[PDB]
Amino acid sequence: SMVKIYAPASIGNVSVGFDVLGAAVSPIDGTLLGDCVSVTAAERFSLHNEGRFVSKLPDDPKQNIVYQCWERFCQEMGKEIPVAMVLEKNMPIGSGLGSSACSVVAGLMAMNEFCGQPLDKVTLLGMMGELEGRVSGSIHFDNVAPCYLGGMQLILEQEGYISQDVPGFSDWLWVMAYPGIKVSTAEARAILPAQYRRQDCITHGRNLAGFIHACHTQQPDLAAKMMKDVIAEPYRTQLLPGFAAARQAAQDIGALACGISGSGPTLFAVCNDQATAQRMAGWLQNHYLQNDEGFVHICRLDTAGARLLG
């Protein structure tokens, strides 16, 4: 009896909603962009790591994100659940693709499914954000909630639910460009300023309020014009060599919007046809990548979220 979960890549913030908005992504070609966790019965607990980025994981086994999921799930159960766990780390660490969230969602969903769904959505998702906090020093739900539930998730920390779904535009493609370098979630958060001018908070509000209003009324142009982040982007693009050039070209080529994915350095660019997305994807390969570890994938929203493979 093996349970194997695929936790997809996700865009934090989505460049208009820092800490309260996120979207799971799926490349159109059918390739998997995510991390995987397997759970099987055993006498004693073991964890082994596989995949392309195994060597990037912690040297301290107890500080592994997937180990900490199991310890947290067992606490919730009141008992230790002996399993052979395997993490397959196919996503780069600190890249902007929801890497820590993939490993949290996959591990906690893997354990909850193995045990027969004892925990409900709100508890488990609350536990997922809990573990994001220990990773970056801050609880936030904008990567785990879409990784988990799929689509675009708006974070609304209410008694009955952590998030609700936001309607998208079926036309929109999301060209994702990981440049081959990493930024820590923690460092990219601490370099944010402690204070902002009143008018930035008025404008941030208007921007988010218009973006949401546009999604529910299905006005894609307006939506793109409201996709502006005055909170984190101005202070983070200094850590993204080449981003500002990417944005200039993105306009020239005809993307509807361009932005940082989570804390970066991965970028995303919105296009509303296949011809535009292909040109954008071609350019980013040629110009946004900093080395051979980088990649580009034309994506759409993943409406499934994390799921069972086997």
UniProtKB/Swiss-Prot annotation:
Q: What does this protein do?
A: Catalyzes the ATP-dependent phosphorylation of L-homoserine to L-homoserine phosphate.
Q: What is this protein called?
A: Homoserine kinase
A molecular function annotated in GO for this UniProt entry is: homoserine kinase activity
**Which Pfam families does the protein's record reference?**
GHMP_kinases_C (PF08544), GHMP_kinases_N (PF00288)
Give the HAMAP family listed for this entry.
Homoser_kinase
Give the EC number(s) under which this enzyme is classified: 2.7.1.39
**Per the database entry, which stretches of residues form a coiled coil?**
none
Species for this entry? Yersinia pestis bv. Antiqua (strain Nepal516)
Instruction: Cite the binding residues for ATP.
Output: P92, I93, G94, S95, G96, L97, G98, S99, S100, A101, C102
Which UniProt key words apply to this protein? Answer: Amino-acid biosynthesis, ATP-binding, Cytoplasm, Kinase, Nucleotide-binding, Threonine biosynthesis, Transferase
Q: What class of enzyme is it?
A: transferase
Designated gene of the protein: thrB
Q: In which pathway does it act?
A: Amino-acid biosynthesis; L-threonine biosynthesis; L-threonine from L-aspartate: step 4/5
Primary place of residence? cytoplasm
Q: Quote the catalytic activity from the record.
A: L-homoserine + ATP = O-phospho-L-homoserine + ADP + H(+)
GO CC: one term? cytoplasm
Which family does the record claim for this protein? Belongs to the GHMP kinase family. Homoserine kinase subfamily.
Protein localization: Cytoplasm
GO biological process: what's one of them?
threonine biosynthetic process
Q: Which SUPFAM superfamilies match?
A: GHMP Kinase, C-terminal domain, Ribosomal protein S5 domain 2-like
Presence of keyword Kinase: yes
